[PDB]
Amino acid sequence: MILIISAMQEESEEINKILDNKEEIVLNDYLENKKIYKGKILGKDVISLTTGIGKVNAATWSSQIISKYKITHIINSGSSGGIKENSNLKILDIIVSSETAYYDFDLTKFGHKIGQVPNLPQKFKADEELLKKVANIVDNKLLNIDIHIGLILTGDQFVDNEKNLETIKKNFKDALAVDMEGAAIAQVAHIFKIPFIIIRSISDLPNNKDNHIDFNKFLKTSSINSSKMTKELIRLI
Amino acid sequence: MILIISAMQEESEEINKILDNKEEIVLNDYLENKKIYKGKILGKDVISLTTGIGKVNAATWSSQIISKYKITHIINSGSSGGIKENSNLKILDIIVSSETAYYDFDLTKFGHKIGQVPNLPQKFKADEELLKKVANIVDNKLLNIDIHIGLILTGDQFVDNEKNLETIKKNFKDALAVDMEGAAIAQVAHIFKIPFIIIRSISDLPNNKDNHIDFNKFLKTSSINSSKMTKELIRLI
Numbered sequence: 001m002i003l004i005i006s007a008m009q010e011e012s013e014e015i016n017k018i019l020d021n022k023e024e025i026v027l028n029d030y031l032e033n034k035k036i037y038k039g040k041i042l043g044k045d046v047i048s049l050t051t052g053i054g055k056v057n058a059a060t061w062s063s064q065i066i067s068k069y070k071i072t073h074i075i076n077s078g079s080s081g082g083i084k085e086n087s088n089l090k091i092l093d094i095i096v097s098s099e100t101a102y103y104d105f106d107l108t109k110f111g112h113k114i115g116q117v118p119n120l121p122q123k124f125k126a127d128e129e130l131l132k133k134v135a136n137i138v139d140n141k142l143l144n145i146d147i148h149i150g151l152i153l154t155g156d157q158f159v160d161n162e163k164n165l166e167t168i169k170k171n172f173k174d175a176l177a178v179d180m181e182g183a184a185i186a187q188v189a190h191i192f193k194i195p196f197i198i199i200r201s202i203s204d205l206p207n208n209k210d211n212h213i214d215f216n217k218f219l220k221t222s223s224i225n226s227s228k229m230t231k232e233l234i235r236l237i
Numbered sequence: 238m239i240l241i242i243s244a245m246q247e248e249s250e251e252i253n254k255i256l257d258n259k260e261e262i263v264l265n266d267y268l269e270n271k272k273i274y275k276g277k278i279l280g281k282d283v284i285s286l287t288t289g290i291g292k293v294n295a296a297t298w299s300s301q302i303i304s305k306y307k308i309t310h311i312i313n314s315g316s317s318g319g320i321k322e323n324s325n326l327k328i329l330d331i332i333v334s335s336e337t338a339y340y341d342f343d344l345t346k347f348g349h350k351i352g353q354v355p356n357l358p359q360k361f362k363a364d365e366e367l368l369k370k371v372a373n374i375v376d377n378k379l380l381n382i383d384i385h386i387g388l389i390l391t392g393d394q395f396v397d398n399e400k401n402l403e404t405i406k407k408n409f410k411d412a413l414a415v416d417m418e419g420a421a422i423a424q425v426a427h428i429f430k431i432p433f434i435i436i437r438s439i440s441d442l443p444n445n446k447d448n449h450i451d452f453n454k455f456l457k458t459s460s461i462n463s464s465k466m467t468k469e470l471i472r473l474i
């Protein structure tokens with residue numbers, strides 16, 4: 001039972017479009033009237049969950065669903081900001097986590113690494129088997145879309161070209177891209193030992209000037225591409 | 238059924254000490270082997286939950302417990318860093334949230350307020366009735382401990398006298414104190430419409446030089462004081 005987690009309705013819509021046997025399920029024990037969609041993708045049981053934005057929304061709703069259903073795999077789909085320079089990163093390209101970490105967590109004063117939560121790795125590793133399946137997709141050129149595999153960084157900010165961007169880069173040199181939920185989901189996954197992977201697509205490049213405009217232009221389409229890659233990964237699960 | 242939430246075992250220990258009919262309950266559907274304690278405080282049903290540190294731990298575990306039990310009230314107990322100057326803030330004093338907000342959430346670029354999560358208030362308001370009960374405790378001088386009521390700020394850093402401290406202050410002038418979980422818990426509470434309040438005690442003052450030493454010295458004792466105030470509030474619930 002595969003949990004596909006997205007932050008924004010635009011991002012989840014590209015997953016919800018491709019569900020077979022789609023049903024609306026309502027969570028309401030606290031009158032929250034929260035709708036999730038359950039269905040199938042290529043014969044595999046899927047829940048599409050929309051969390052809202054940021055670490056606490058992602059953690060809160062992932063946790064709810066994990067409590068109420070037997071989740072075997074977590075896929076975090078949606079948009080990402082591509083940050084790594086001179087490495088062929090383009091808007092609409094696919095970004096896949098080999099690892100993820102917070103850039104905005106800091107108990108350095110107590111000797112933990114930058115981004116590291118106590119008793120957890122600094123870098124949550126995506127599932128070995130999910131990564132081999134990504135390799136397969138890359139090697140067989142199923143998508144006419146460049147795929148980058150690497151470190152995705154998470155924090156509760158929409159990253160722009162202010163000097164916020166440069167200190168992240170200096171803290172994690174090899175970092176590929178950013179998001180507002182990836183390592184929150186990875187932390188939840190770690191706690192419940194559920195294999196995870198982050199599968200996003202580049203909506204914008206933070207270094208560039210009005211990246212929020214590109215972000216608005218490409219959100220839906222980057223969601224299309226994330227969903228296509230998610231579909232192909234599910235084929236192999 | 239009152240959920241008392243603490244981040245550190247030292248903080249939860251001061252709550253667990255005062256539970257009557259204390260039982261260990263094990264959550265293990267994912268082999269996480271997570272222990273929570275259930276009991277009574279002055280005849281009122283209580284779950285003491287220890288989350289681990291930071292926003293995602295707090296959100297993840299609060300969410301789990303809320304899924305599995307009928308929670309009527311949330312109290313966030315533990316230690317806090319007192320930041321507001323020239324207002325009689327002392328180590329071991331009690332800090333009570335009238336409101337709480339993140340200092341480290343920023344979608345300003347999209348026009349939201351500093352700290353504000355989309356579709357949520359910038360400032361989560363503690364429960365009106367819990368606040369009146371705090372007033373009662375203050376007015377009747379039940380504790381020989383100064384109580385401050387105000388804005389508590391949350392983010393995923395241990396706050397020190399680096400210039401991190403000053404930009405928080407400039408973003409929220411009236412701010413009283415900081416913590417790493419308060420507004421994460423307030424966000425969860427908001428989602429499930431559960432009345433919350435943050436009841437902490439000052440372990441340290443960030444402006445001062447080696448505040449991490451004071452934090453280590455006073456963690457247990459500030460936890461004692463938070464627990465005493467929590468007890469008195471529960472008396473009135």
Ligand SMILES: Nc1ncnc2[nH]cnc12
Nearest residue numbers: 079080081158159179180
């Ligand atoms: N620039 C950015 N910052 C944070 N999250 C994003 N998701 C897509 N683009 C982003």
Ligand SMILES: Nc1ncnc2[nH]cnc12
Nearest residue numbers: 316317318395396416417
């Ligand atoms: N200085 C500080 N920063 C964050 N959380 C705290 N809890 C107690 N003291 C603190």
